[PDB]
Amino acid sequence: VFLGFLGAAGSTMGAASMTLTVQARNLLSGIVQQQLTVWGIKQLQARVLAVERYLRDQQLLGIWGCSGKLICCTNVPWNSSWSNRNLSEIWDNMTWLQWDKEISNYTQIIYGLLEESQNQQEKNEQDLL
């Protein structure tokens, strides 16, 4: 569906965030998915690997309690050591490529803190009945 895709990258993170489905809709089907085991086996291998990549990201969102929707609020505070910019500065003057580089150092830390959704689920059961 190259009606629009990574062209979102030409603008700011704020603007790009309004078209997230544009890329999502292009992540599951390569040319081989639209369409002598020699050579042909590679197409089979590629399809399998594409599936695995997709599912790994979905599993991570599941674990974090962010499965479903494009945007997920986490209830985990942002650390002051991760960046030092105005919120509006990053959303209006930075692109996603720039941002990803700027906070690459904290990827594992941030993800580790998203394990807190597990504590939230225990609390919710106790007060839910």
Added chain:
Amino acid sequence: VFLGFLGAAGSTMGAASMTLTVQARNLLSGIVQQQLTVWGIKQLQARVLAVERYLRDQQLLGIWGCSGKLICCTNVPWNSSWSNRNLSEIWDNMTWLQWDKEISNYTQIIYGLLEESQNQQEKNEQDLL
């Protein structure tokens, strides 16, 4: 991520329930997923089967209306014939391995009753508009 995993099994179901993401995060990638079709074909076959197992459990949760989260309340009452223990007795003195054996006999029955989520969805549409 063997930082922690099945070691949860050493304790009670209650305690173990607080670390469910510990195992979930280790279910999608074997050594062959981290990394002459003779011999090598086995790695391809294994990756595919691992995917199928994962999806079958996710599909079942989807059908039951329990897709998402670690813990799902069902609105299906527990039968008195399934076990005869105090609720606190199983959560504080039993392990999950022991529990799974104790109620193995009712697996299909319990799952069959989780089809009730379908009736709930019909009722919800009618009163939702």
Added chain:
Amino acid sequence: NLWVTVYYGVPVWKDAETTLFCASDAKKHNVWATHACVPTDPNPQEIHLENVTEEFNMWKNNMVEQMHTDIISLWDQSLKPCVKLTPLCVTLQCTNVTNNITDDMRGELKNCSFNMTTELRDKKQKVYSLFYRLDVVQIYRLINCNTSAITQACPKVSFEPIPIHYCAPAGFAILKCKDKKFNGTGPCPSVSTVQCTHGIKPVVSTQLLLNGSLAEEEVMIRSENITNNAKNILVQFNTPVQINCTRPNNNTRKSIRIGPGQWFYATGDIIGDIRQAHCNVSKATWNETLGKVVKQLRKHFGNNTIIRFANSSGGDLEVTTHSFNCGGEFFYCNTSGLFNSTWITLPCRIKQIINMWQRIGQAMYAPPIQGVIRCVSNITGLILTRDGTETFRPGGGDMRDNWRSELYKYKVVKIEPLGVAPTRCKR
């Protein structure tokens, strides 16, 4: 008081090495025809990107290695299940052909007889064929008999240079550089994202690059390192030049039974007079392209520096001659008449046993072809080396550079849709 927010579908990427898949042209045993990629066509899937300047480097492009790897694999798969000419690795009794042969053909054709096997494993037969001297050794014998196994290419298999298109697998995308006068490396201010590349014909040749794309405006000269005399220099013309190659000597072939379901194709007598193969180049345009090349070479070597073109000195046919494949016949033509100038008839030879990629032999044995051959190609480029006034000579290189010369505009990256940023929203 900021919070972590997770975003999915984020338009970012990183360089990656993956397998690209081919696509076919629809419109039938022409190699690519069996190992079909499934036809595509309505796929002008091109999106312009604003800003996002990205870098390219054609000498580090892994796509080149894939093209090499799969074309050689397919070559073997197509030719593996054929005859295996074990019985032809025998002693030859040869004489000279005494027919009406011109001076330029003296010593070129041999008439050889030998004891060949039959379908009935009791008996032998007396068989003869004409041979070209380049495939025969005087002790006579076939020249590759003492080295490795020889086969016969299947007569119904045709390795036609059908253009092949490549597309990304899911999770990947291809970035195309549209920068005018891009020299092959560094930042490319104008990039678009595509689903697939244009088609590229699998043309394998030496010295001159045939039937490729043309430069948009100027003749482009690029290399990994301009000042390194150990490197090959790639020249792309903005104007095509036609070359007309012919193979005279109308002939036929004989189908000889060699075993129970196995046949060999022999070369019959020539009809009419005997002449050599050759190619025609228009002197007017050859002179123009070299002058254009020099004007551009002077940009790096000095416009007060005299530039000379000279012969392809080296130790073998696969080094010194211009290799062509027309009608299934393999030609080794003399280009010394082209690279002779300080700032057109080219005689040509043919062979049946072709090693292609060295390795161990392969020896597909191009079968004899009946009638005559007429083949006209588009010269689109040139590969040169320098010896260091400076002198350039036709260069070398593997078939890899006959891909690189077209592949340079494309790069593949991996999409990474999931990431985070601060927001004011808490769950």
Added chain:
Amino acid sequence: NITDDMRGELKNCSFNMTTELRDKKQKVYSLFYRLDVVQI
């Protein structure tokens, strides 16, 4: 110069072997160990 413990262990055998050129044969020999060779 073979010791007592090696008597009968080594054979020197010749035979008509094929060549690369399918017209001719060659005379070739090799030593062999008795455990891989049978007397007819």
Added chain:
Amino acid sequence: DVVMTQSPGFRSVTLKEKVSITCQASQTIGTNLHWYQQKPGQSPKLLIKYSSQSISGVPSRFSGSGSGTDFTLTINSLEADDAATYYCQQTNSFPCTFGPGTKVEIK
């Protein structure tokens, strides 16, 4: 069990000397080795973790590395305040174990 040894039993060193001691395991422990020190009459202190990671509160003169069965502790320039018995511990395989320690005496 993982048996840990240390060598030398003690080391006789002088001030401003660059010095080192080593630890060995009977079986590979990957990189799961930690270095501790203790002075007479004092509680233990952790100086290096996971073979080569630094710890706040530990002077920059202390460093080390290792893997598998062979690890090294070193001091870039020995200070009087560094006299201590140094110890290795492994966390690769339960029960957790430790070596006998190496005494460093300063002259």
Added chain:
Amino acid sequence: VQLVQSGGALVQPGASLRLSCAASEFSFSTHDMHWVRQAPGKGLEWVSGINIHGGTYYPDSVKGRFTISRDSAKNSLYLQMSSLRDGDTAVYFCARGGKPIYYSGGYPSWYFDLWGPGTPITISS
């Protein structure tokens, strides 16, 4: 920040004894806690531990004789030992498990960031 400890003691063989530690300026509820003992002439033998969820770990050298417990309400730790031997003479310590590299749940890192001062027990006739 420190682990505040009880004083030492002399007991007869076969005696039981309870040791304790307290959290000064931190909560025990946020850390995995362990006990080790240092016999004269020895290094630190791990004795016991409890995780943040109340799960426990023991050596076979003390299992069945020693029990570890926690009461987070008062920020206190306990080690209860029965049937003590002369061979159990040692300085006992509490220690705060060091922070792990990546989340494990109630599974200890087995190394320590914080050590207490030491509480000797002598067992003799």
